[PDB]
Amino acid sequence: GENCTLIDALLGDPQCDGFQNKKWDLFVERSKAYSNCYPYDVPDYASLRSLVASSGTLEFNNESFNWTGVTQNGTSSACIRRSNNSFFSRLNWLTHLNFKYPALNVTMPNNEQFDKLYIWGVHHPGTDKDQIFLYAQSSGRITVSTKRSQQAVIPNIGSRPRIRNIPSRISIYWTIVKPGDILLINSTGNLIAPRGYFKIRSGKSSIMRSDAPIGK
Amino acid sequence: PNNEQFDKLYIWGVHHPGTDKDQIFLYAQSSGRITVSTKRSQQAVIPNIGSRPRIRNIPSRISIYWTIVKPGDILLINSTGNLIAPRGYFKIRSGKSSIMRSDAPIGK
Amino acid sequence: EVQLVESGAEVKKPGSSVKVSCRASGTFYKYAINWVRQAPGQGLEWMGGIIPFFGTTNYAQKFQGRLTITADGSTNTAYMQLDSLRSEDTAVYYCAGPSITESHYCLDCAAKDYYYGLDVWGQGTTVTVSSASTKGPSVFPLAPSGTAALGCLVKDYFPEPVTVSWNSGALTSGVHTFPAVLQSSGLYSLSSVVTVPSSSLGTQTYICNVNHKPSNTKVDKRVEPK
Amino acid sequence: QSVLTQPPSASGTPGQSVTISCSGSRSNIGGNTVNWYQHLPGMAPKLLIYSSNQRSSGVPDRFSGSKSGTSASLAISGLQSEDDADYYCASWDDSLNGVVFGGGTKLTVLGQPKAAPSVTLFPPSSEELQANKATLVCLISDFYPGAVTVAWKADSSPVKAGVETTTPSKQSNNKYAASSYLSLTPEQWKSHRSYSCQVTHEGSTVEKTVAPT
Ligand SMILES: *[C@@H]1O[C@H](CO)[C@@H](O[C@@H]2O[C@H](CO)[C@@H](O[C@@H]3O[C@H](CO[C@H]4O[C@H](CO)[C@@H](O)[C@H](O)[C@@H]4O)[C@@H](O)[C@H](O[C@H]4O[C@H](CO)[C@@H](O)[C@H](O)[C@@H]4O)[C@@H]3O)[C@H](O)[C@H]2NC(C)=O)[C@H](O)[C@H]1NC(C)=O
Ligand SMILES: *[C@@H]1O[C@H](CO)[C@@H](O[C@@H]2O[C@H](CO)[C@@H](O[C@@H]3O[C@H](CO[C@H]4O[C@H](CO)[C@@H](O)[C@H](O)[C@@H]4O)[C@@H](O)[C@H](O[C@H]4O[C@H](CO)[C@@H](O)[C@H](O)[C@@H]4O)[C@@H]3O)[C@H](O)[C@H]2NC(C)=O)[C@H](O)[C@H]1NC(C)=O
Ligand SMILES: *[C@@H]1O[C@H](CO)[C@@H](O[C@@H]2O[C@H](CO)[C@@H](O)[C@H](O)[C@H]2NC(C)=O)[C@H](O)[C@H]1NC(C)=O
Ligand SMILES: *[C@@H]1O[C@H](CO)[C@@H](O[C@@H]2O[C@H](CO)[C@@H](O)[C@H](O)[C@H]2NC(C)=O)[C@H](O)[C@H]1NC(C)=O
Ligand SMILES: *[C@@H]1O[C@H](CO)[C@@H](O[C@@H]2O[C@H](CO)[C@@H](O)[C@H](O)[C@H]2NC(C)=O)[C@H](O)[C@H]1NC(C)=O
């Protein structure tokens, strides 16, 4: 993993771009690892980390979501890629377009024969000023559902202690969609959109924390 | 700020008054809101106004929360009402200590 | 892609305030709208800019406290207001911005990151700062000195424009009417001269016809040797 | 003093080439991209170069921009008459927190031989003298490039007060024109043997003189 945690390689921190779609039997996390993108947290970080470790793959398939109505690909100076302002490779920061953020109601069927792992997030801006500024309305709201699950999140506007000069935060969530099931995203703001899904496998893979060098 | 070399344990709470009358009354506004954060965590709580079964004649409630702050980290409390504030922190140690439920007398 | 159109030319007395508008043909919200001026005989001068998406304004030190820039997204119009005007504020005022787009727009950056080379320009707004109200011209003959030059001096009028013909338009060859000077008085002056054969000074008649529409004044002056 | 320093002038003949330099400091050119603008009489500026070395849409490759250290350059080859213009560099300045421009370079494309100015000087008219004013009128025509300076003298003594001078303007024949005016009291005008209007163009000075008599 070198400088990257599993979660950071997943999300697509620019310095972890080399990790895209790679597989492992054993992923090794170094104590020296650090994030250098937009500051984030993961509710139940340990479980997501765990399920990915066990799946043993970063294979990602891009999908064409219908984000008509909004501006896609929002970026930040806290997340530099090739010397320019960027964002997580696998995530899509949506903002208003022409001062509207229409309520999004976007669908994505799993018509595959395998499960899809979707990684998405909610942005918690540091001020109301940022709120109006990003989403052109005072309060965003996100509902992510399948036939067999639902995850509803209310953005929390407010300052957090600055991380790499950033007082705002993103909260990360995940959703598995079985074949025959459907991903539904209903949002009115603050959605950090997935660009697709990760494939999820089962097998002998795991993760270990260690600072021992790799030998031939 | 935790500018100490040991961890700090902060204990705090949120007050859930029994009526709107109490709400306006305590905090001078209809809806309080509390966000307590550090560099590595955030805990946001919305007060819930409403009657609970009275306890010792009290229909309102307080919910207790805790937050650990590492050295180099900072406690941040953002609130618009209903905050039951900590007066400080507890030191947190590690060792062989535990707890047991028992009604046995203590002997010399 | 977007086109920029500014409000018409303006004239203000010293100490007063002026506001210039800048209407874009579509959304133009993401990048910095800059304001830049040119005083006569001076170089281009950056006054300031705003990154509308943020409302953030940047101003040149020379104008801080007296320049205010606004962006009203709802009508796609930008504005420049400059208070306590002095003669030094006489200039062509342009608004401008970039046709830049990005696959990915920055949401929390330093102001400098939304400023780019300006390839979209307004047509410019002429602002004149003067204590002069509207005034018709005084016109003086310029007597002739192998050709000779004679003409008419059109002094102390305001505002532009003035027109000049010779012999009611019948005389056109050899005519050179010069651009006006903007004087320290705040009034304009120009001259029109005709170059004629010197041999024909004795018999031929030369009358200049000066028209100043803003003051609704017209002047005819016969121009003879002294 | 502009924050960026540019030479006031540059020149070449058709098909030749020129380079125009632009000098700044760590706070500007050193850490920021450079923009270059062309400015023709009467219209808004046009962007030629951005991001120091990239050409704007539709601009031919004979305009090129560069930057190194704390200085930038605009180079122009294959010179044509229409390249005659003022050229400005610009960049962000990190200390001022704003955009700064150089002073401009007047580039002359000598697609016609350098042409000396025709100067005409008029004394005050009798009507004006009777109205207790006096203006001498110095009219300058047919010069190229489009830059002159004007000095005034009472007899042989330099006169600085009461002078009003236009910017040069393009004539219909593509050489340039300008006018200059001197305000005097009638008392001043009649008291000197003569006055002169002195026009300097590319270092060469010609003058016209008038007398009360
Ligand atoms: C609740 O209360 C908290 C705590 O007080 C507030 O948090 C503050 O937020 C402000 C506003 O952004 C912060 O201001 C910034 O401070 C920076 C300090 O960093 C310096 O020191 C570090 C460590 O050595 C260096 O790494 C760094 O390089 C600096 O030397 C400044 O750098 C910032 O200045 C920049 O921004 C301003 C514009 O805001 C520009 O004018 C400057 O030119 C410069 O570019 C900036 O001033 C501050 O740090 C926070 N305080 C603390 C103690 O954390 C919250 O704002 C408040 N929340 C709400 C909702 O009100
Ligand atoms: C939802 O529904 C619940 C249940 O109906 C409501 O709860 C009631 O709240 C009322 C008002 O606060 C309570 O009324 C009070 O009852 C007291 C009796 O409690 C006795 O408890 C034990 C058991 O017998 C005794 O040993 C003890 O000594 C107590 O006497 C009275 O004593 C109170 O009277 C006092 O206050 C009133 C003013 O309010 C004065 O006028 C009197 O002089 C005196 O000082 C009082 O009558 C009631 O007990 C609650 N009901 C129950 C069954 O618990 C919620 O309020 C409701 N929530 C909402 C939001 O609607
Ligand atoms: C992981 O990131 C660290 C920290 O930025 C890198 O360490 C730097 O390495 C360079 C090259 O040797 C040094 O010049 C710097 O002094 C180091 N920076 C710090 C802060 O220690 C490291 O290169 C990265 N590791 C890998 C393998 O990519
Ligand atoms: C938002 O940004 C993404 C990421 O760059 C864009 O994805 C690119 O799209 C082009 C056109 O299909 C592809 O050729 C690239 O391979 C994609 N890049 C990456 C890194 O995946 C996407 O086009 C942008 N969204 C929209 C609709 O503009
Ligand atoms: C989920 O998306 C739907 C559909 O876009 C949203 O419905 C909109 O609600 C707003 C606010 O009341 C209305 O003004 C719009 O007319 C509705 N849009 C459409 C196209 O019908 C809904 O609000 C969203 N729900 C949540 C919880 O975010």
mmCIF file of C-alpha atoms in Angstrom, chain C residues 34 36 38 40-46 58-59 94 111-112 115-119 121-123 140-145 149-151 153 155-156 176 178-185 189-191 193 221 226, chain D residues 31-32 35 37 39 42-47 50 56 88 92 94 96-99 101-103 120 122-128 131 133 135 137 139-141 164-167 169 171 177-179 181 183 212:
data_model
loop_
_atom_site.group_PDB
_atom_site.id
_atom_site.type_symbol
_atom_site.label_atom_id
_atom_site.label_comp_id
_atom_site.label_asym_id
_atom_site.label_seq_id
_atom_site.Cartn_x
_atom_site.Cartn_y
_atom_site.Cartn_z
ATOM 1 C CA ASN C 34 -12.540 41.548 -14.952
ATOM 2 C CA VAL C 36 -9.972 47.097 -17.210
ATOM 3 C CA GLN C 38 -7.773 52.989 -20.690
ATOM 4 C CA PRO C 40 -6.375 58.687 -23.218
ATOM 5 C CA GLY C 41 -2.632 58.340 -23.826
ATOM 6 C CA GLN C 42 -2.358 55.842 -20.983
ATOM 7 C CA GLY C 43 -1.852 52.084 -20.898
ATOM 8 C CA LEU C 44 -4.480 49.469 -20.126
ATOM 9 C CA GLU C 45 -5.243 49.537 -16.413
ATOM 10 C CA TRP C 46 -6.572 46.682 -14.368
ATOM 11 C CA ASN C 58 -10.478 41.721 -5.966
ATOM 12 C CA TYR C 59 -9.630 45.411 -6.417
ATOM 13 C CA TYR C 94 -14.330 47.488 -20.769
ATOM 14 C CA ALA C 111 -9.211 33.703 -5.719
ATOM 15 C CA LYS C 112 -6.344 33.661 -8.227
ATOM 16 C CA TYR C 115 -8.683 34.335 -13.208
ATOM 17 C CA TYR C 116 -7.631 33.537 -16.809
ATOM 18 C CA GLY C 117 -6.576 35.249 -19.999
ATOM 19 C CA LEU C 118 -9.432 37.402 -21.240
ATOM 20 C CA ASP C 119 -10.694 36.344 -24.666
ATOM 21 C CA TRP C 121 -14.649 41.391 -24.293
ATOM 22 C CA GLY C 122 -17.390 43.983 -24.030
ATOM 23 C CA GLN C 123 -17.555 46.774 -26.619
ATOM 24 C CA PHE C 140 -13.052 80.672 -35.059
ATOM 25 C CA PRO C 141 -11.619 81.154 -38.552
ATOM 26 C CA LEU C 142 -8.119 79.973 -39.273
ATOM 27 C CA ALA C 143 -6.809 82.301 -41.968
ATOM 28 C CA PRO C 144 -4.515 80.924 -44.715
ATOM 29 C CA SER C 145 -0.739 81.277 -44.216
ATOM 30 C CA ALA C 149 -3.818 75.592 -45.437
ATOM 31 C CA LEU C 150 -6.861 77.309 -43.888
ATOM 32 C CA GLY C 151 -9.506 76.010 -41.496
ATOM 33 C CA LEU C 153 -11.271 76.189 -34.883
ATOM 34 C CA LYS C 155 -13.526 75.552 -29.372
ATOM 35 C CA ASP C 156 -15.052 74.716 -26.026
ATOM 36 C CA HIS C 176 -9.037 66.957 -43.024
ATOM 37 C CA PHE C 178 -9.106 66.394 -36.766
ATOM 38 C CA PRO C 179 -10.150 64.430 -33.680
ATOM 39 C CA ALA C 180 -11.060 66.641 -30.764
ATOM 40 C CA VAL C 181 -8.790 67.301 -27.790
ATOM 41 C CA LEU C 182 -10.297 66.926 -24.343
ATOM 42 C CA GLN C 183 -9.127 70.052 -22.509
ATOM 43 C CA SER C 184 -8.331 70.715 -18.837
ATOM 44 C CA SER C 185 -11.580 72.690 -18.752
ATOM 45 C CA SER C 189 -12.004 71.337 -29.167
ATOM 46 C CA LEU C 190 -11.237 70.241 -32.730
ATOM 47 C CA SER C 191 -10.211 71.734 -36.060
ATOM 48 C CA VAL C 193 -8.642 72.252 -42.346
ATOM 49 C CA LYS C 221 -18.099 80.941 -40.629
ATOM 50 C CA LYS C 226 -6.228 88.486 -42.850
ATOM 51 C CA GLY D 31 4.992 32.097 -10.030
ATOM 52 C CA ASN D 32 2.161 32.830 -12.475
ATOM 53 C CA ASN D 35 -1.055 36.703 -20.822
ATOM 54 C CA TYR D 37 -2.770 41.303 -25.451
ATOM 55 C CA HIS D 39 -4.681 46.534 -28.741
ATOM 56 C CA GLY D 42 -10.844 52.069 -31.048
ATOM 57 C CA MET D 43 -11.630 48.455 -30.145
ATOM 58 C CA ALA D 44 -11.274 46.132 -27.202
ATOM 59 C CA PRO D 45 -7.986 44.233 -26.742
ATOM 60 C CA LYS D 46 -7.667 40.745 -28.146
ATOM 61 C CA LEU D 47 -5.934 37.851 -26.350
ATOM 62 C CA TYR D 50 -2.269 32.745 -22.443
ATOM 63 C CA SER D 56 -5.517 31.706 -28.413
ATOM 64 C CA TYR D 88 0.492 44.294 -23.308
ATOM 65 C CA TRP D 92 -1.513 37.599 -11.479
ATOM 66 C CA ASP D 94 0.655 37.186 -5.485
ATOM 67 C CA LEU D 96 -0.953 42.565 -4.510
ATOM 68 C CA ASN D 97 -3.537 39.806 -4.842
ATOM 69 C CA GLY D 98 -4.561 41.042 -8.276
ATOM 70 C CA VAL D 99 -3.673 41.274 -11.953
ATOM 71 C CA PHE D 101 -0.018 44.769 -16.646
ATOM 72 C CA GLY D 102 3.215 45.894 -18.237
ATOM 73 C CA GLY D 103 3.360 49.411 -19.649
ATOM 74 C CA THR D 120 0.449 73.385 -39.745
ATOM 75 C CA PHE D 122 -2.272 78.834 -36.808
ATOM 76 C CA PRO D 123 -2.099 82.018 -34.731
ATOM 77 C CA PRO D 124 -5.132 83.311 -32.812
ATOM 78 C CA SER D 125 -7.908 84.688 -35.004
ATOM 79 C CA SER D 126 -8.862 88.343 -34.561
ATOM 80 C CA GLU D 127 -12.359 87.367 -33.320
ATOM 81 C CA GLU D 128 -10.916 85.338 -30.488
ATOM 82 C CA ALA D 131 -13.094 87.815 -26.898
ATOM 83 C CA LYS D 133 -8.622 84.735 -25.361
ATOM 84 C CA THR D 135 -5.240 79.935 -28.967
ATOM 85 C CA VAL D 137 -3.243 75.763 -33.197
ATOM 86 C CA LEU D 139 -1.978 70.613 -36.695
ATOM 87 C CA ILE D 140 0.149 67.629 -37.482
ATOM 88 C CA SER D 141 -0.557 65.184 -40.287
ATOM 89 C CA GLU D 164 -3.406 70.483 -24.657
ATOM 90 C CA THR D 165 -2.326 67.627 -26.867
ATOM 91 C CA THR D 166 -4.369 64.873 -28.480
ATOM 92 C CA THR D 167 -3.480 61.261 -28.865
ATOM 93 C CA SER D 169 -5.245 58.997 -34.559
ATOM 94 C CA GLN D 171 -6.067 58.981 -40.927
ATOM 95 C CA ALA D 177 -2.849 62.632 -37.269
ATOM 96 C CA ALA D 178 -2.851 64.791 -34.121
ATOM 97 C CA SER D 179 -3.572 68.352 -32.920
ATOM 98 C CA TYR D 181 -3.440 73.798 -28.707
ATOM 99 C CA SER D 183 -3.932 78.972 -24.582
ATOM 100 C CA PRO D 212 1.623 88.852 -34.040
#
